[PDB]
Every structure is written in C-alpha cells, then in structure tokens.
C-alpha cells in the first residue's frame with residue numbers, strides 16, 4: 001500500500017481501539033496498525049524525496065516506525081493478558097509518536 005493509505009489505516013484502527021469493548025477488537029486493531037506501520041516504513045515521504053535513501057533524515061523517518069511498532073507491541077502484550085483498559089490507555093502514547101514524527105516529516 002502507499003504511504004497515504006497506510007496512514008489512513010493507522011487512523012482507522014486508533015479510533016477502533018478508543019471505542020473498543022473487548023480484547024479481540026483491541027488486539028485485531030493493534031495487529032493491523034503494526035502491519036501498516038511496517039508497510040509505511042519502506043516509503044519515501046514527499047518532504048524527503050530529494051534526500052538520499054540512506055541519509056540520516058531517512059534513517060530517522062524509518063526509526064519513527066520502529067518506535068511505533070515497539071509501542072504497539074507493548075499495548076498488544078497488555079491486551080493479550082486481559083488488561084484491556086490498560087492497553088487502551090497505553091495506545092494513547094502512539095499519539096505522542098504521531099505528533100513528534102508528523103512535526104518533522106508531514
């Protein structure tokens with residue numbers, strides 16, 4: 001999928017997690033976010049199109065998805081342990097990462 005479509009998928013699932021009633025809904029949503037983040041990681045964002053693919057900026061852009069995947073893994077862990085509300089609260093941290101990386105590259 002392209003970068004924009006993967007961003008919509010992340011947004012779609014963040015909202016599902018916020019309104020979720022059970023662990024399956026939260027687990028499934030985090031699972032789809034993780035796959036979209038990994039798909040997005042291979043893209044070149046518009047703002048960095050004139051930089052080399054291996055530049056410090058492109059490496060930082062890719063690192064933003066490694067942070068996001070780590071945060072999703074932490075929330076997935078809690079949801080799998082039946083700590084649903086804790087997983088939903090943990091998922092809010094993804095917004096900090098979104099905000100910091102959007103600030104830089106969106």
Ligand code: HEM
Pocket residue numbers: 003004005006007008009010011014045046061062063064065068094095097098101102105106
């Ligand atoms: C849960 C985390 C995130 C959410 C919910 C999110 C959501 C979005 C949304 C809704 C858009 C608008 C475009 C569209 O999808 O139609 C967007 C754009 C974008 N996001 Fe994210 N994002 C997240 C994390 C990140 C991270 C971590 C990065 C960088 C590592 C990033 C980089 C970008 C870029 C570069 C654009 C602009 C793409 C373009 O103009 O084609 N996003 N994001």
